[PDB]
Amino acid sequence: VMMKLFYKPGACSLSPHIVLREAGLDFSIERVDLVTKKTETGADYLSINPKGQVPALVLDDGSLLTEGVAIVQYLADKVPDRHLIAPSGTLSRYHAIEWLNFIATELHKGFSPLFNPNTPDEYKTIVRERLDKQFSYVDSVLAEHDYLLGKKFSVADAYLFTVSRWANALNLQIKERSHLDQYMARVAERPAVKAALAAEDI
Amino acid sequence: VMMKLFYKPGACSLSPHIVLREAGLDFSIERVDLVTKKTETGADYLSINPKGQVPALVLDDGSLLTEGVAIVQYLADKVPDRHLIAPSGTLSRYHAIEWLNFIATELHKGFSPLFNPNTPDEYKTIVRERLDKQFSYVDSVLAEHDYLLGKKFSVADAYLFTVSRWANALNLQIKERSHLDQYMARVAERPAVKAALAAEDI
Numbered sequence A, B: 001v002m003m004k005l006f007y008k009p010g011a012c013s014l015s016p017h018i019v020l021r022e023a024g025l026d027f028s029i030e031r032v033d034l035v036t037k038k039t040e041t042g043a044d045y046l047s048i049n050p051k052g053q054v055p056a057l058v059l060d061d062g063s064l065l066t067e068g069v070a071i072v073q074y075l076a077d078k079v080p081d082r083h084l085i086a087p088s089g090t091l092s093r094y095h096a097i098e099w100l101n102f103i104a105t106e107l108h109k110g111f112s113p114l115f116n117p118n119t120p121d122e123y124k125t126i127v128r129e130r131l132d133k134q135f136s137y138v139d140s141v142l143a144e145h146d147y148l149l150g151k152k153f154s155v156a157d158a159y160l161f162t163v164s165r166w167a168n169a170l171n172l173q174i175k176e177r178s179h180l181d182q183y184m185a186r187v188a189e190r191p192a193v194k195a196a197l198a199a200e201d202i
């Protein structure tokens, strides 16, 4: 069967959405309401992904893959000719895995209290201060080469771009951001990024 | 030179510490004071890992690998005959990566607000409720086979064991835990696990 990506516009699922397009693979997308857990076809999403989260990818064997970091690696490895991640077993691949884990744990999950309407303002300020430090660190790495892992665009950039959009939407203060901003401007120009954004109507 | 793991007793670094011992690799360890950022030799830890966290693994070429998820895959891939993780390219490997990311993002980082004395009670309550659901979900998986990924012990078990110890230290309420508790008793018997704990003076 053709792959299907479950997504919410602008959510973390934008990362494998971009990767799908960078990879030139065939796929469809299906929007999910994360509150009601119903998809845009009326389907009960919990019967699909019990974790009730996006992204989830239906593979061509009909099975489901969850967790963004797993999905983008799966997709990149399907298209080695596109060099969207270093080949398995190489030190470069372990550093790609390192950065994917950093993005998932320190950036992505770092936003959790900010998106919870039960979190009080004062704690949100503390959370924002930590994200300042983390994004500023990323900025320092981006001073050294065009993309996160080096000179070449990779799946880690799809993920970084996605969470960085949240930083801008939340008007996050970032002390060191000049390299990050130039990086974001460039990544936003990629045809696959533009097409993913258009498909999500954002 | 011999690979070196920087760790703090009982912290997330216990995971790659267990994996090192299970792998049978040559290594040394060095303890870090996370408050002062000095190691047990008095060395400046920020000079070693600018992120200032454990675990960090210095490889035999003198380079730095951070992020527990990256480290445990690097280590397991070095010893494929021990089958501590599925081989690359296989659907099973993507399921392992899926579980490692879940542990990193939903369990490990789930605990972060609970260890910070600046987190207000009301948010800690929300976090505890989510972890109850997440550990109960893990329990439901452990009800169906001996270890997290299936019939065999893997690096994901080293990681799950490590964060589950925190759940016990924090008296975390877990609705479904009979399988998780049996599993913890089992993993705790492994000589490599015992050796890691003894080396960390736990």
Ligand SMILES: N[C@@H](CCC(=O)N[C@@H](CS)C(=O)NCC(=O)O)C(=O)O
Residues within 6 Å of the ligand: A011, A012, A013, A034, A035, A052, A053, A054, A055, A066, A067, A068, A069, A104, B101, B102, B105, B106
């Ligand atoms: N650990 C998951 C987390 C993914 C995640 O946090 N998805 C959010 C959107 S950014 C979500 O689906 N929340 C669903 C909800 O309302 O419970 C991963 O890394 O893929």
Ligand SMILES: N[C@@H](CCC(=O)N[C@@H](CS)C(=O)NCC(=O)O)C(=O)O
Residues within 6 Å of the ligand: A101, A102, A105, A106, B011, B012, B013, B034, B035, B052, B053, B054, B055, B066, B067, B068, B069, B104
């Ligand atoms: N994203 C990192 C997080 C590592 C982490 O959170 N380490 C904690 C110990 S559990 C730490 O070193 N905190 C430093 C501190 O307390 O200042 C990873 O997955 O390895």
Ligand SMILES: [Cl-]
Residues within 6 Å of the ligand: A025, A026, A027, A028
């Ligand atoms: Cl298509």
